[PDB]
Amino acid sequence: LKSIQADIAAKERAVRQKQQQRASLLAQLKKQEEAISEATRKLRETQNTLNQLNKQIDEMNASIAKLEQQKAAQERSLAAQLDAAFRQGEHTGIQLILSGEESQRGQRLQAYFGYLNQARQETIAQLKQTREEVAMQRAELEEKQSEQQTLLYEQRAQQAKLTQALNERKKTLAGLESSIQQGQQQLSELRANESRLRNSIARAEAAAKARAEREAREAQAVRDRQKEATRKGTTYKPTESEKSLMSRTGGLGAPRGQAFWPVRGPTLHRYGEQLQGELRWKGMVIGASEGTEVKAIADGRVILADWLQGYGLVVVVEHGKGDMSLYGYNQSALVSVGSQVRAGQPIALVGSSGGQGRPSLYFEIRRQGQAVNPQPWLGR
Amino acid sequence: NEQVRYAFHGALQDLKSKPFATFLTVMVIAISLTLPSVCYMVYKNVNQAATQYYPSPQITVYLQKTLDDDAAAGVVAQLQAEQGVEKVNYLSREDALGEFRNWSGFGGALDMLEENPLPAVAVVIPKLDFQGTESLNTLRDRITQINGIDEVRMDDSWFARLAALTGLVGRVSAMIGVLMVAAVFLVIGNSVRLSIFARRDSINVQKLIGATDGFILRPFLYGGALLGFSGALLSLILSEILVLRLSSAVAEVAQVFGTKFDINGLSFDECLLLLLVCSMIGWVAAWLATVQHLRHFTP
Amino acid sequence: NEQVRYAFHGALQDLKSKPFATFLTVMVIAISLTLPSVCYMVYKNVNQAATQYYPSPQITVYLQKTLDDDAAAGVVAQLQAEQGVEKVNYLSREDALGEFRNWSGFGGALDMLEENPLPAVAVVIPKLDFQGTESLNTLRDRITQINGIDEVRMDDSWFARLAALTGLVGRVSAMIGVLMVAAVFLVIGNSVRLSIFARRDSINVQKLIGATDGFILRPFLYGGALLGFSGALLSLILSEILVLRLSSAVAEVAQVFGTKFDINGLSFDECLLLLLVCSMIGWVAAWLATVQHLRHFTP
Amino acid sequence: MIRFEHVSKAYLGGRQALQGVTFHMQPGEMAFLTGHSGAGKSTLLKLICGIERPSAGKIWFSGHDITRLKNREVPFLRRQIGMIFQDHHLLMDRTVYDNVAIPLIIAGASGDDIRRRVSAALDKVGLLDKAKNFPIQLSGGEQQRVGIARAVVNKPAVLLADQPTGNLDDALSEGILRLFEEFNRVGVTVLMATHDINLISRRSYRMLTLSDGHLHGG
Amino acid sequence: MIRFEHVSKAYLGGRQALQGVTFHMQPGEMAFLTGHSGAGKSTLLKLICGIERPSAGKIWFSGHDITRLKNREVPFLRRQIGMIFQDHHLLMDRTVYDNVAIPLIIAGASGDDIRRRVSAALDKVGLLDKAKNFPIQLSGGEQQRVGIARAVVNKPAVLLADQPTGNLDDALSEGILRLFEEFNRVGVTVLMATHDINLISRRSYRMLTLSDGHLHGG
Numbered sequence A: 001l002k003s004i005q006a007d008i009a010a011k012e013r014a015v016r017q018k019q020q021q022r023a024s025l026l027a028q029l030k031k032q033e034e035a036i037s038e039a040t041r042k043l044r045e046t047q048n049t050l051n052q053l054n055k056q057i058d059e060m061n062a063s064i065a066k067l068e069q070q071k072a073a074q075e076r077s078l079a080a081q082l083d084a085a086f087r088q089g090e091h092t093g094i095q096l097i098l099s100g101e102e103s104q105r106g107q108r109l110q111a112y113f114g115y116l117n118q119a120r121q122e123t124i125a126q127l128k129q130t131r132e133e134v135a136m137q138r139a140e141l142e143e144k145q146s147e148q149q150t151l152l153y154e155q156r157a158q159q160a161k162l163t164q165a166l167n168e169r170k171k172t173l174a175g176l177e178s179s180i181q182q183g184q185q186q187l188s189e190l191r192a193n194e195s196r197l198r199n200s201i202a203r204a205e206a207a208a209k210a211r212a213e214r215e216a217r218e219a220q221a222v223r224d225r226q227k228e229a230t231r232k233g234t235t236y237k238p239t240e241s242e243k244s245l246m247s248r249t250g251g252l253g254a255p256r257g258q259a260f261w262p263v264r265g266p267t268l269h270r271y272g273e274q275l276q277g278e279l280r281w282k283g284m285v286i287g288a289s290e291g292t293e294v295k296a297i298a299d300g301r302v303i304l305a306d307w308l309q310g311y312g313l314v315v316v317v318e319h320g321k322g323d324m325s326l327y328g329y330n331q332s333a334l335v336s337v338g339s340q341v342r343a344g345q346p347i348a349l350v351g352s353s354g355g356q357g358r359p360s361l362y363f364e365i366r367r368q369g370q371a372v373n374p375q376p377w378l379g380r
Numbered sequence B, C: 001n002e003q004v005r006y007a008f009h010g011a012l013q014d015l016k017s018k019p020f021a022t023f024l025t026v027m028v029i030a031i032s033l034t035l036p037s038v039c040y041m042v043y044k045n046v047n048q049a050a051t052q053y054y055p056s057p058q059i060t061v062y063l064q065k066t067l068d069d070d071a072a073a074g075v076v077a078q079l080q081a082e083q084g085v086e087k088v089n090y091l092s093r094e095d096a097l098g099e100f101r102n103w104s105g106f107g108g109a110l111d112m113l114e115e116n117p118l119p120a121v122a123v124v125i126p127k128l129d130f131q132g133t134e135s136l137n138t139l140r141d142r143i144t145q146i147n148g149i150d151e152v153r154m155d156d157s158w159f160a161r162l163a164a165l166t167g168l169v170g171r172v173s174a175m176i177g178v179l180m181v182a183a184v185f186l187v188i189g190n191s192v193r194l195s196i197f198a199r200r201d202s203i204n205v206q207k208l209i210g211a212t213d214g215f216i217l218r219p220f221l222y223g224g225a226l227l228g229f230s231g232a233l234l235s236l237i238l239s240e241i242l243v244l245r246l247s248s249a250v251a252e253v254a255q256v257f258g259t260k261f262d263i264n265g266l267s268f269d270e271c272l273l274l275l276l277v278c279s280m281i282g283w284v285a286a287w288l289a290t291v292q293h294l295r296h297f298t299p
Numbered sequence D, E: 001m002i003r004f005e006h007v008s009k010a011y012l013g014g015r016q017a018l019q020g021v022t023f024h025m026q027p028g029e030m031a032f033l034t035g036h037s038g039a040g041k042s043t044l045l046k047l048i049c050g051i052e053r054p055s056a057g058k059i060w061f062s063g064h065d066i067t068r069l070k071n072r073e074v075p076f077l078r079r080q081i082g083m084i085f086q087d088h089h090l091l092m093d094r095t096v097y098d099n100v101a102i103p104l105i106i107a108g109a110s111g112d113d114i115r116r117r118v119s120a121a122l123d124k125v126g127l128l129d130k131a132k133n134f135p136i137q138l139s140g141g142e143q144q145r146v147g148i149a150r151a152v153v154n155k156p157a158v159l160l161a162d163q164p165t166g167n168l169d170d171a172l173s174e175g176i177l178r179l180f181e182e183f184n185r186v187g188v189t190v191l192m193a194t195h196d197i198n199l200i201s202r203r204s205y206r207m208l209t210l211s212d213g214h215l216h217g218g
Ligand SMILES: Nc1ncnc2c1ncn2[C@@H]1O[C@H](COP(=O)(O)OP(=O)(O)OP(=O)(O)O)[C@@H](O)[C@H]1O
Pocket: D011, D012, D015, D017, D035, D036, D037, D038, D039, D040, D041, D042, D043, D044, E136, E137, E138, E139, E140, E141, E142, E167
């Protein structure tokens, strides 16, 4: 009686806990991708500071050359110009000259004595200016190096904190990777997990959605004005600001591969083929090693860059007209909820976040909310 | 005209009568007279003779960095050859580079101080055009108004150093010459006066026998001109022994100091003048003394 | 005792007998004597000025980086204090740092150009044996290229030019001076001899009774000193009046072209020497001239 | 041709040598001027000759007044007379031929004529032997005779002798007086001042005595 | 004291003034010396004085041979002698007081004695009034007597007179001879050369005659 119930409970105890831990800590892995996004922004700032420090070292070497060679050799020269009174020169020459002065008066007026002293004074003014400029350039290089070093220290502290957080989140991600799921469970719980991930994606899309429609309307208005100018016997050329506003997110257009390549790498799966069960494949998947990026198929606004189960901190950069090739398992975040990213420009550097084993750029060609074939979407 | 011959014979006999008295009088006249004729070598030779230009302001405008080989003629076409200027001393660029190195200014900084910016320029010789004081002065800045030449080190030179010779020297030597050319007159006149005073007795004797005022005079005049003439001739025999001897010393210092000053001697055009002047001095002294001692014996 | 007074009275009597002749003789002597005095004045003043200007240069061997305190001690033990050297002018390091700063060259570059590499100047005035340029010649290079200091700031032969000028203002002025003293010698001698010849008619004193040669001589010796002495007395007055005239103009020119190096006169000793020498020469000439007559008036 | 009209001569100092002398001598006339020592004889001869100037009175020589004579016309008065001085006034640096010949040279004669006339005049006194000697190499009487030869060599118009026979013995004194008389026989007026009493006692000539500057002799 | 032994003198030039003169004159012995002109009288007096040197023979003065006298001893011999020349040889630029007084100055005598003795000697010859006049302001006779006064002032031992009377009248000549006699009466040896006859005829003294340098009297 009760023995059967106890045995059934013992056999079916931990499956739900394992699945819940897997899903929740895959979301936590996507959160770790967001933390790595902060760390990577700090690392890009540190790389900019390191380039600035290298430029400051080059400027310090140029200052070495100019001012320190001035000091050593050209101040041997300067103190020799002064030695023309101090060391083997002049000694306050006031002795009367003899008949037929071969220079020796023009000398002390402006020649190897007088113009020597005149050019010495000119070069002393030049060297005082050079020393003031050396001090100014040393101050400038020190300010650049202090900006670089303060940025490096702040970024190092932030990166250490983010590294501790990412270690904790990586333990969580292993706890996620512990478990697996079943088939009808796949259908149901995968509908739920995709609902949650797309709910985050749609929060980001509602934050950053108006841009595409506004740009499409602006492009339509520009085209209408250009057409009407011909009807009025003129030509309506939009200004630079007007052209920039109109062509920001004018739409994805026909898929022909005319946009920047999101990432270079091999492709494994094909759009419309058998990906998982009888469900049609959402799009072509770039199967390769982890770290390969992904972005929009055309210029537009980023519809999503945030933690999402399965797709990681997916950079779902919408190319316009509903086409959002998400950066699956993205480990970064550049265009957050409210910002925009175009084709090639990744709102997030893809990786192995969100539970995905490696970078699989499942670029879903979403046409009217439905999957489309991406095979002819590569022309250049 | 036997009176002239008789008077000359008497004067010659009177001179020959005392060979030691005559010789010691010619000796002092010649020595007292060679000083004007040997100190005239100095002011004729050397000084005046070797007149080597003077501290003239050949100094000129200082050209800027725009000066070049072509600009040198352009400055000449404006000031260095079109305005007042005689010669060209444009030592621009490398010209006043090695010369500046070998002068009192030591080199070696040029290899260290990039390139020497020797302020360009070009010493000029203001010809008549600008030669004149005012011709320069005002138009000196007008000369500056030519091509480029950022500055204009044009100067003056000479200064007071050209006064401690036109002043101190210009009076002392003239004073010394005046002293000597008074001493020669004084010594000749004194010698002749004493010679007449020695033989005043014959003047008295032949005056109180009749005679005339002019007969008594001739043997004394001809014996006073012959004393100046013979004492000046020996000064020309001297004053060439000394000058030729001094030629050795001047020749030695020629190479040691520089330009070789050339010494020379007295010319005929001045030798004849000296002989004539001494003869006239002796003659007039004899006339004065005899006329003074001829109104004494007239009671 | 009384003979001295009688002889002096006779000398004064025959001096004042003919005022014009004695005045003319004195004027000739004074005029012939005021020339060498002026020449000696100008020579002495020029010599004093030249000595005050520059006796010797301070050009030495320029020290390399090897110079230090110990190296300066070694340079003293070698050349700067043991070889030809009068004083020590080792201005090594900071000694020639402020001095260079306050020299003609502007300072202040030390605060900017790290440290000023001032040389170790080791100036020393060589002794008289090494003072000579000919003595210096190779030894000067040898002294410079001995040890320690590397370079050598050689002299410009200004001392040699001064030496040549002094040799000229020597030889030439020496010949002028000997000529002038011979001139005054002969002037005094001839004047005394001619006066004695005029007053020779005193064979009577020698013939009359035993007026020994000593008795005859004394009126003529004392009358010869009185002639030379009065010539020297008038020269001193005449010489000093002349230089006062050529002093205000001369002194002003010196101030403009340097410092007002005026002209001085004679010390008391120089005047006494001149008077004594002139009196002595007159005495000797009177003795010679009279003894000439005392022999041809004898049997 | 000699006239003294109240002549007086006082030298500078206060010694009145001559006082109120008046007399007359005709052309061609001999006379002796006698007096004591210091009387005024050489002063009178000096006044006649032209050496001294009177303080008062008039002297007429050859009819022309000479009491005030210009310094230009004196040499033409002193040329007409032959004067024999007392110092012998010789040129001691010339020969005796030159001493005797100098009047002819002054007057401007020829050369051979000078030689002949000097030889004649030197023979007349006995000194032709000594014509090449200087006057230092002669005795006192010989120098006196050189002066006398000089005086007569030019044929004068007046002879003025001042003790011309001192330093000469009696034979020579008589010879010199005979020479003077033979010159006076031609028409030469002689005036000879003498201290000899024997010489004048043996002849009959006018005799002007002079006693302390007072003639009272003629 | 004077003595000549075969003394001869030929002047340089070829003129034998004297030949073979020999004589003796004792202390205090007056004598006259006579002859024609050019005989050789002043030459004899010059040999005695020391002015000339004999070419032969010997001369003795006071017993000392003076024929070869030195030049440092002639002064004392000439001091022992009072001589009056024919030229008077007197300084022309000193007062006659100085001329008369110079022998006393040479001798070395005091001042009061000089004034007293010069006054006495000037008065003896009659010139005391002219003690201040220069010799140019005197006549021939007055200059002669200045010479005589200078000679007789120093009280000599031999007095050598060389025609001391020419230029003096007869009364003055007698006065001068009487002065020489008053000097000789003391013991002074007088030798008087003269060729006037009225003086040496009225007095009986030894007379030495010369004729062309040969003593015809002795
Ligand atoms: N130059 C003279 N100056 C002044 N008085 C003089 C001059 N010459 C002579 N006496 C004086 O004038 C007077 C006359 O002198 P003067 O020469 O005429 O005499 P004297 O007759 O020639 O004499 P003696 O017969 O002695 O030769 C005398 O008192 C004399 O001293």
